[PDB]
């Protein structure tokens, strides 16, 4: 796909499936580790980890 | 001036009989000063409401009703039946409806397998078009408040109280009970100085 935020959506897909099994630090309390991977659509939402 | 008496009052029967004279009121000579409300339909609506809810909250809600202000309920068919009724006679669609839905509804073609109309159909909600909706879960107090403020109160259920209910669509689409006593035909009064009713109010 030509969506520039594709690599992040690939990463967050596995992070969503592994909540409670493996934990990583997010940025804020809005875009947490259980937020749907479809929401990560803009460059500003790319996590630091 | 609204006066409440502990008896059932009707427009014609309570006028024919001396209800005020029965209670002991002195004669008023010309009767143009007084006018009687009709609350028998309100009473059977009260029984119907009591069938579903508790007595106390329904009574408390009905206390706050202003009998000097007119308003009516507009009963709508279910969502699907409303869609077919709009598909027929397409002049009925209001302006608030989505442009894509309106154009697709004018398709005048079998829309079962278009799937764009279908995804729009799952997307559609009646509350989007009509703001005041009882939705069969609304509290009686909220019913009475929405009836007090405004003239037309839209509803999707028949278990309401306070005013006459008018159909929005032909009877074919409605599959509910044939409560013709409160439900009128699909197609379509000043107060005197003194108005006599049954239920007291504190509005």
């Amino acid at each position: 796909t030509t969506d520039p935020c594709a690599p992040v959506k690939a990463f967050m897909t596995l992070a969503n499936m592994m909540v409670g099994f493996e934990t990583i630090p997010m940025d804020n309390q809005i875009y947490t580790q259980s937020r749907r991977a479809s929401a990560f659509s803009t460059p500003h939402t790319w996590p630091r980890c | 001036a609204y006066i409440a008496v502990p008896a059932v009052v009707d427009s014609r029967s309570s006028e024919a009989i001396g209800l005020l004279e029965s209670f002991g009121v002195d004669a008023g000579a010309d009767a143009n000063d007084v006018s009687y409300q009709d609350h028998d339909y309100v009473l059977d609506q009260l029984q119907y409401m009591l069938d579903g809810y508790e007595a106390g909250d329904v009574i408390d809600a009905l206390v706050h009703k202003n009998w000097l202000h007119h308003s009516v309920y507009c009963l709508l068919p279910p969502k699907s039946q409303l869609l077919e009724y709009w598909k027929s006679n397409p002049s009925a669609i209001p302006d608030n409806v989505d442009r894509r839905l309106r154009k697709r509804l004018m398709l005048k073609k079998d829309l079962r397998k278009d799937d764009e109309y279908n995804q729009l159909a799952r997307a559609f909600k009646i509350s989007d078009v009509y703001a005041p909706l009882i939705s069969s879960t609304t509290s009686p107090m909220t019913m009475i408040q929405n009836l007090n403020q405004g003239e037309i109160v839209y509803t999707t259920t028949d278990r309401v109280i306070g005013a006459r209910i008018l159909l929005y669509a032909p009877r074919k689409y409605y599959a509910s009970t044939l409560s013709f006593t409160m439900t009128k035909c699909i197609i379509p009064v000043p107060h005197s100085r003194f108005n006599v009713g049954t239920f007291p109010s504190i509005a």
Binding site: - | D95, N96, V97, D98, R99, R100, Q119, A123
Partner: protein
């Protein structure tokens, strides 16, 4: 009413409708912002009291 009958201004809601002229994807379920604002504005109504 007196002001309306003497002012050269004329209110034509079709200006809003013509300029929008946009559309969203068929699969896109979120209603295009264009169709959303048009529903709120209601250009067909002609009362301006």
């Amino acid at each position: 009413v007196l002001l309306q009958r003497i002012s050269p201004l004329q209110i034509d809601p079709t200006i809003i409708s013509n300029t929008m002229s946009t559309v969203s994807e068929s699969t896109t379920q979120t209603l295009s912002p264009a169709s959303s604002i048009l529903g709120k504005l209601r250009p067909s109504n002609s009362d301006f009291s």
